[PDB]
Amino acid sequence: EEKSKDVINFTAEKLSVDEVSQLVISPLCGAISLFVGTTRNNFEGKKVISLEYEAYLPMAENEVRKICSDIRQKWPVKHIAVFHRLGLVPVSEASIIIAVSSAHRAASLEAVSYAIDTLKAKVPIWKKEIYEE
Amino acid sequence: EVEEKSKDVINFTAEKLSVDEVSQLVISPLCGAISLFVGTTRNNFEGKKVISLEYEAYLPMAENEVRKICSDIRQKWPVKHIAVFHRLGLVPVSEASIIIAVSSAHRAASLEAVSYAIDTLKAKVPIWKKEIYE
């Protein structure tokens, strides 16, 4: 018997795809799907050196919990993890990592896609592009 | 605006797979999205307890089929790097038998590519799995 987990974290720290995958590991699961959001080095023509992220944390957390609850109603997932970085996120570093685990791949795949689309659509987190001055 | 040659990294190996090492292979400054799928040995199958899965790959056919998958992906979606690692031999419970990673400018490509990749690999690539019980 293993209680299912929702691990949600907003943090200024560098996100590690390894540490996050570990959080959703289970012997009852055969699939883990992940999404990693990275700072791309350009936006509409100009060179980007980093992205800066801000949020109203309480609200943001609450919205991520809604997403988790919704996921668990539509799919038989086991563990979910959602990490978002705040502050400056330099090029090629991760601003968001999501991971979901399940018995079979369909659930985890569909869950992760929904998670990322929904988070981008519904969570109060903003970004400012930092260029070269 | 440097050119960075796009990569297809395909590997069959008896070694333990690392989700970190595989993600590194598809990293790009031109990409904002990396999607991954990790296949793990589940500890049961139709009632009975499983201790490991054993995988055997018909080669080089299995490589050739993974290359087809990569080519097909690149015809429909604007992905940048693809990586497909499959472990062979005994893969104990909770360890990874397959890690697929795809990167792109934007998330739709990488999400869609990875699902297509895993479904298609399970459908078309000649790898035999035998359940090992207790």
Do B95 and B83 contact (CB within 8 A), yes or no?
A: no
| B65: Cβ contacts below 8 Å, ≥ 6 apart | B121, B124, B125, B126
- The DSSP annotation for A27-89 comes to TT-SEEEEEEEE--SEETTEE--EEEEEE-HHHHHHHHHHHHHHHHHHS-EEEEEEEEE-EEE
Asked whether A35 and A111 are in contact (CB, 8 A), the reply is: no
Interchain contact A40–B (C-beta under 8 A): yes
Q: What domains does chain B contain, in order, with CATH numbers? A: 1-134 (3.90.1170.40)
C-alpha span between A20 and A97 (Å, rounded): 7
Question: Which of these, B44, B120, B113, lies nearest to B81 by C-alpha position?
Answer: B113
**A55–chain B Cβ distance below 8 A for any pair:** no
Cβ contacts of B111 on chain A, cutoff 8 Å: 35, 112-113, 116
Q: Is B57 exposed, middle or buried (0-12, 13-18, 19+ CB in 10 A)?
A: middle
Contact residues on chain A for B30, CB-CB shorter than 8 A: 40-42
Contact A77, A102 (CB under 8 A): yes
Residue A56 one-letter amino acid = Y
Chain A residue with minimum CA distance to B33: A37
Q: Token pair of B119, please?
A: 């479904």
| Technique of determination | X-ray
Does residue B90 sit at the A interface (CB-CB below 8 Å)? no
For A72-97, give one letter per residue: b (16+ CB within 10 A) or e.
beebebbbbbbbbbbeebebeebbbb
Beta strands per DSSP E along chain B: 8-13, 33-40, 44-45, 48-57, 79-87, 89-92, 96-104, 127-133
On whether the CB atoms of residues A23 and A81 are closer than 8 A, the answer is yes
Is B51 within 8 Å of chain A by CB? no
How distant, in Å, are the alpha carbons of A126, A129, B23, B36 from that of A18?
Answer: 25, 27, 9, 12
Amino acid at B129: K
Chain A contact set for B119 (CB, 8 A): 105
Tell me if A127 is assigned to a ligand binding site.
Answer: yes
Chain A positions in Cβ-Cβ contact with residue B28 (cut-off 8 Å) = 92
Q: Is the dihedral of CA A108, A112, A114, A115 positive or negative?
A: positive
C-alpha R_g of chain B: 15
Does the distance separating the beta carbons of A36 and B23 come in below 8 Å? yes
